[PDB]
From Swiss-Prot:
The active site is at D35, S199. Disulfide bonds join C255-C290. The chain holds residues 90 to 419 of 419 of the full protein. Belongs to the peptidase A1 family. This is Endothiapepsin. Its EC number is 3.4.23.22. Keywords: Aspartyl protease, Disulfide bond, Hydrolase, Protease, Signal, Zymogen. Residues 17-328 form the Peptidase A1 domain.
Length: 330
């Protein structure tokens, strides 16, 4: 089997991408944030504290003939950005882009943090990291991808995020028309439960490439590119007037600037992030200070190849027995 679904930016900055997901019978379609940095499929639901729902589409398990309470199971997750959610668990039929999993753990939110409430466009998350991170207790549950894997034509999914435009998540096949040149594959460590890999270096604009190992995770659920302070300092030093602002919470730059590109290494290959991808616009409405798309990972504890980086590539998440990551230009 295969599946193919379009993923759509939630706003004009590409702060996140939502992908429609069919849950239950008859289908209830929710727009979920596919997150290769976590491993819980959770949704706003009929059980979510009413004051914490503000415009989201909810899953109502009582209206699904295939929903079954997973008795005794609870979940609770905290994300890197400080947001969180928790609740109980149903199993139900879940389909993405024509690909159907029966018996998928659908984690029903009883509580969500303010960040989620305030984002009316995201109805929940669909985790695509390794199932070892799944938070369901006392019986850990598998991700959608893990459940689908054996049925897939090939044990892969691909992320093809657009810049200020829709893109595609595919399951079970590699669309050879969706990228240019060749796909370069690189080793993955699953030791932390992430799609963790090592970039071979970077360049700033038309500058020379610096060969240096940068360990990080391919994380579709993170907006920006978070890299070591050295790397990030080198990037923003090429933008006149750019500075790190503790009050704002990262590097800002004059909105009048033309940003340089940023290149990262994948083996001997190179992925170029155009400067425009690194512009996240005014820090506040009407401000001439703009927020940068490359930020320091210092204090996160891990480097994160988030959407800023991933949307510059066609990315293969290879879930074979020995997982790997593939990157191509497009």
């Amino acid at each position: 089997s295969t599946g193919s679904a379009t993923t759509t930016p939630i706003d004009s900055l590409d702060d996140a991408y939502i992908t429609p997901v069919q849950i239950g019978t008859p289908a209830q379609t929710l727009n979920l944030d596919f997150d290769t940095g976590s491993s819980d499929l959770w949704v706003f639901s009929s059980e979510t504290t009413a004051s914490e729902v503000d415009g989201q589409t909810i899953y109502t398990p009582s209206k699904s003939t295939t929903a079954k309470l997973l008795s005794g199971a609870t979940w609770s997750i905290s994300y890197g950005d400080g947001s969180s959610s928790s609740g109980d668990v149903y199993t139900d039929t879940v389909s993405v882009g024509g690909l159907t999993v029966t018996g998928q753990a659908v984690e029903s939110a009883k509580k969500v943090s303010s960040s989620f409430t305030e984002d009316s466009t995201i109805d929940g998350l669909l985790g695509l990291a390794f199932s070892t991170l799944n938070t369901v207790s006392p019986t850990q549950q598998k991700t959608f991808f893990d459940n689908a894997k054996a049925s897939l034509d090939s044990p892969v999914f691909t992320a093809d995020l657009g810049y200020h435009a829709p893109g595609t998540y595919n399951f079970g096949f590699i669309d050879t028309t969706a990228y240019t040149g060749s796909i370069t594959y690189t080793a993955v460590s699953t030791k932390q439960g992430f799609w963790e890999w090592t970039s071979t270096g970077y360049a700033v604009g038309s500058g020379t490439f610096k060969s240096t190992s940068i360990d990080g995770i391919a994380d579709t659920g993170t907006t920006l590119l978070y890299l070591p302070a050295t790397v990030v300092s080198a990037y923003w030093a090429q933008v006149s007037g750019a500075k790190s602002s503790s009050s704002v919470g990262g590097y800002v730059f004059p909105c009048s600037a033309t940003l340089p590109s940023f290149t990262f290494g994948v083996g001997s290959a190179r992925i170029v992030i155009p400067g425009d991808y690194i512009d996240f616009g005014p820090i506040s409405t009407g401000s001439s200070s703009c927020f940068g798309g490359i930020q320091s990972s210092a204090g996160i504890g891990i480097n994160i190849f988030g959407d800023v980086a991933l949307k510059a590539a066609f990315v293969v998440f290879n879930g074979a027995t020995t997982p790997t990551l593939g990157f191509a230009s497009k």
